[PDB]
Amino acid sequence: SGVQVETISPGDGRTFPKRGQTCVVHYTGMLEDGKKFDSSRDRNKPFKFMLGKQEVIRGWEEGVAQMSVGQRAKLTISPDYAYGATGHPGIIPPHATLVFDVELLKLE
Amino acid sequence: GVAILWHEMWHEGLEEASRLYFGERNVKGMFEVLEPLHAMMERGPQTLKETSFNQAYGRDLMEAQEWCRKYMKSGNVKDLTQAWDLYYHVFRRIS
Ligand SMILES: CO[C@H]1C[C@@H]2CC[C@@H](C)[C@@](O)(O2)C(=O)C(=O)N2CCCC[C@H]2C(=O)O[C@H]([C@H](C)C[C@@H]2CC[C@@H](O)[C@H](OC)C2)C[C@@H](OC)[C@H](C)/C=C(\C)[C@@H](O)[C@@H](OC)C(=O)[C@H](C)C[C@H](C)/C=C/C=C/C=C/1C
Q1: In chain B, N or C terminus with fewer CB closer than 10 Å?
Q2: Residue of chain B nearest A57, judged by CA positions
Q3: Where N6-acetyllysine occurs along the chain (chain A)?
Q4: CA dihedral B62, B67, B72, B75 (to 10 degrees)
């Protein structure tokens, strides 16, 4: 259960993502063993999403909220907070511990 | 609040499709909302607002269908995600 966050590089501190704003990020998702399943860094375009509206998984909904602007971090998401018993067919299997490297670049 | 125009239809259509596939794993149900919208494009635009939509997003949507057809033949879900990357691009620009 939960989502253990470990920082790679620090943010500004004061500026946080409130409800309404669109979190523009770069990210890299990889499985518990090490192997990589998705990455925006490899595509060379950042990923935008509106926080607070249940758009993304529970690990991101609480994990990205606690992060400040300009902060890189390693979010070790549990299967309770991730896709879980069902999973996501042919990508994420049942009961997977998802390791998400992510960098909150711009609040927008 | 009834979707007449194409951008209005494609907005709530992809929102319904994305909820079915990603939220509920319903692949068949995801196609049942997609396939009629793609069929109306294939018939062609009538109004100016339909034509200007087809100029902007029609190439992206037709490519997203081609990736969806590649999923039907192959079965590899990696092809279906490539369609959903294109569908997300057109959704934000409409939003
Ligand atoms: C091909 O690109 C895929 C993403 C792939 C898909 C496969 C994944 C393994 C992964 O590779 O991403 C991955 O790395 C990952 O795990 N990600 C992504 C980044 C954040 C964390 C996490 C991650 O949470 O993603 C999310 C999960 C899948 C479903 C969510 C989990 C929470 C749950 O409540 C929700 O129930 C409805 C389903 C996918 C999201 O995309 C960010 C997209 C944007 C959101 C949704 C499908 C829904 O919310 C949807 O509702 C109706 C919406 O509102 C949007 C705004 C509507 C719009 C039409 C949808 C477009 C579809 C876009 C698809 C994209 C960009």
Answers
A1: N
A2: B23
A3: 53
A4: -170
